[PDB]
Design a protein around this ligand. Structure first.
Ligand SMILES: [Zn+2]
Ligand SMILES: [Zn+2]
Lengths: 118, 118
């Protein structure tokens, strides 16, 4: 329970996003979207790695920047995925992007809550 | 043995570097050098996170950029720590930095060997 459970669920979301965004990149085959999604996937991979290891750094000043950067990534992801969602005319994929955005929004709120006190 | 043992030793080196560089920050009390060291520490933390999780991504295109970026960080660390070592007049700390640099050099060689075929 508690925060460790919240972080586990964030990690599970990020893992799913990678798989889902890789499917979306295969369906679309557009070069602007490929560059955006490639970089989002890179971020999501790092978020998984860092949050899996986060206990090691709880007493270390580095924790402030680790969480700040993950939150900043997620904020950028919402903006970019919203842009892609608006640009597309492909209702199934637009709905998938909307659901990913909802996850990213929740992650920002939860990580902000944790970052506040660390 | 094999690559997994090489990666385990790289991770153990990075963990040690963080502790050692944090000691060096505390001995030096020097804001300009300390800012450089704080950024190196942030990189080392991410290297540990990413290499601990690396099996997850071996079949994924992201693996190329994950390893490329770690290697690029290590290359920058050598340049910056070499310049810092030359700047200091503090033989014990200069020797500590020399040994960290040696580790970073070995990491680049081993990760380049691993990167080649992935
Ligand atoms: Zn995310
Ligand atoms: Zn290193």
């Amino acid at each position: 329970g508690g925060i460790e459970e919240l972080l586990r669920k964030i990690i599970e979301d990020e893992v799913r996003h990678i798989a889902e965004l890789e499917d979306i990149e295969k369906w679309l085959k557009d070069p602007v979207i490929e560059e955006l999604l490639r970089k989002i996937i890179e971020d999501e991979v790092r978020h998984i790695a860092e949050l899996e290891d986060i206990e090691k750094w709880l007493k270390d000043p580095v924790i402030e920047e680790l969480l700040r950067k993950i939150i900043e990534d997620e904020v950028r992801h919402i903006a970019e995925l919203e842009d892609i969602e608006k640009w597309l005319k492909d209702p199934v994929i637009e709905e998938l992007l909307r659901k990913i955005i909802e996850d990213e929004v929740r992650h920002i709120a939860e990580l902000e809550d944790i970052e506040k006190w660390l």
